[model samples]
Target: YKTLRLGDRGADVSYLQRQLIAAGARLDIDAIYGSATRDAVMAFQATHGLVADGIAGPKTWSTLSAGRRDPRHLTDADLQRAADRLQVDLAAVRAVNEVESKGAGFLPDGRPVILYERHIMYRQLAAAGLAAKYPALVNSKRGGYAGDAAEYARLASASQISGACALEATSWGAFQIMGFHWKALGYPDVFAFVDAMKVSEAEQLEAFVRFVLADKVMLAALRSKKWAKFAELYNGKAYAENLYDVKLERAFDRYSRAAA
Candidate 1:
């Protein structure tokens, strides 16, 4: 109810609802016949640290939508380059991205939950207590990029968080490619890759290729449609291979269907 009203006021409310769903908050349509919607809205307001009023006002709505990531738009060229580098059909790449980001323009900074103290890294900030909290996040030996970033981030300064990509500690680049293995392909500092987030599609695509080519284990994993398993193993999230309860067969079907 509150979301609908806020969305009606011109904010992108659709994604707002999606975030709520992701956070385990479900909205039921069947029960909203009369004042029930209003009552629920008031409850939502209370829980969100908003005024305990049964109204869908601007203040409450803005607070809810404040955390949403306004993604940067993508262009046709992005897809073209991705296709050329990946050696996969352009359509397949497009479909994969559509599923990956729901065809959104930019990857949200604080969206898409990860298994760490920090879910997303906008550019990396110097906040207190991050290192002591997540010891595996920062590393010391290679305090820059090119090694396990998780380990780096734990020991190194919190500023390096924004320096690299996926494995902020052990990985670098938008695609989260490991520098310890593929440092020859990119840069010395992981944050150098993070700064180029706006146009890292090609970098990410190329990183995927390098990571695949560098390790036979990685290559075998990708070819076997075990990308999820490999991702888990590569990043220590083997248990979360089913991030969306999506089986490998479904991904294979999607890839095959897109090719056809």
Candidate 2:
């Protein structure tokens, strides 16, 4: 699904090679051992399901391999299992699909840097204190948003070479939205962060479903498809809530469906 490569620092590298291989992706290690290393390294992580952390960790290892021996599809039903429980309206999900990924998967993009980094950091900051304020709607780890951004970048980059390319572009997971905002989630080495952001596409989507359901009982609204709420919840409220509706709507539609 994704490949890991770094400078000839092989032994000194981020321990990415083994971690990714263990998780079930293939990489041409020899070629990636040097030059433009981070880009290639981050790109690989972005693709294979790692968090783009550049430095491998438990989360990266778990996500890269997770339950699926093959990166092409989702497995390890446990991680993605919660998504089915949402019981969201297939019609609404379908509508969201039409607008978002055009029925692909959750949000995906080539260079979603700016927004991605901003969202995650804001999330971390808000989570520090806001958790008490919005207990029902808030869930945060000290640097959870940072982690998410890394994972998202990894996943996004990994999928880069697989699909129709253009279709891949159009049907990015979740919101089908695109831009530097993705990197905005927090991790500086977009790929490095992505290399480490793996909650798994399945877990990631499940998280979204839970977040959406919470907002369902009038606690909040779906607003649009650009994924503003989704982003906000993952990022920060002031930021997520303020996002454009079209963005939230598109993202929701694309990502709502559990990738078969």
Candidate 3:
């Protein structure tokens, strides 16, 4: 609701610190926008094509609020690479992406589409030995279609308890891949993976490619256009309930015809 900058101190500063950390900034959450926080903010601004004036203004706030993937960041070469890697039709890959995120990565306010799993946060905290410190995270029932404003607010707040756990509990980017898959996707660490997510949609697509290629059976299903099989493996058993398979086929056909 207001501008944030160095020397500012409040819940907003603390929230900013938490988000910086989630975006791979090495800093503590103390609710004070100090030199370190300013540095991190500048770094984020520089990376995201903002002013980099070490201030969290509207543009900077917008980028920080949204998820990593922006359609504007996607490239034809990247899409082709993903399709080639999957050994599937370009239309098929586009179909999957369309169905998954409607080819839109960030909300208007700059927040990425996200679904925070409170249950996962609870389990992550307990595993990290900080369950007692963040009991609110354990019992939280608030999540779903959280806009840019609410998403970061919740994440930054929870991250103060445990950055790793908080990150794991949130799905990110256009594909909404779980942060826990950092290692599986060949990233050195969760932070490294997250930094990639903050970059561009090309990186997000690359991550998704790695996700699909890691499972041979899933890749096989996708390549074969076995909508039901792919949907079952990718979307889980409830894929039928959502008619994901039907949607996948429809999207694929739509893309195919457009390409024809």
TM-score versus the correct structure, for each prediction: 0.40, 0.27, 0.65
How far is 98's C-alpha from truth in model 1 (Å)?
A: 5.5
lDDT of 1: 0.43
Q: Give the lowest summed-lDDT range of ten residues in model 1.
A: 110-119
lDDT of 2 by residue, 5-41 (tens): 3334545343555544454545544434443444443
Model 2: how far residue 206 lies from native, Å: 9.0
| Top lDDT model | 3
Show the lowest summed lDDT stretch of 10 residues, model 2.
162-171
What lDDT does model 3 reach?
0.74
Which candidate should be chosen as best, given TM-score against the real structure? 3
> Is 1 or 2 the stronger prediction by TM-score?
1
What lDDT is reached at residue 143 by model 2? 25
- Against the reference, the lDDT scores of all candidates come to 0.43, 0.37, 0.74
Model 3 ranges off by over 4 Å: 1-72, 109-111, 129-136, 139-147
Instruction: Compose the digit string of candidate 1's lDDT tens values, residues 1-260.
Output: 34353214223344444444444456543323224444454456556654333345444455555732222333345555666665555554444443343222123452221122232332233331143554444433222323232433332444444433333523333344543343555545544543443353444545555555566775555455464655455445553554521433354454465336
Order of the predicted models by lDDT, top scorer first: 3, 1, 2
Q: Encode model 3's per-residue lDDT on 1-260: one tens digit a residue.
A: 46897689999998888887887889888999987898788678656654344667655666787744244455445666789988889988877875765344555665555556667888777677644555545554544435555778778877887798878887877788888888887899888887777776677777789999988999999999999999999899999999899989987886676457
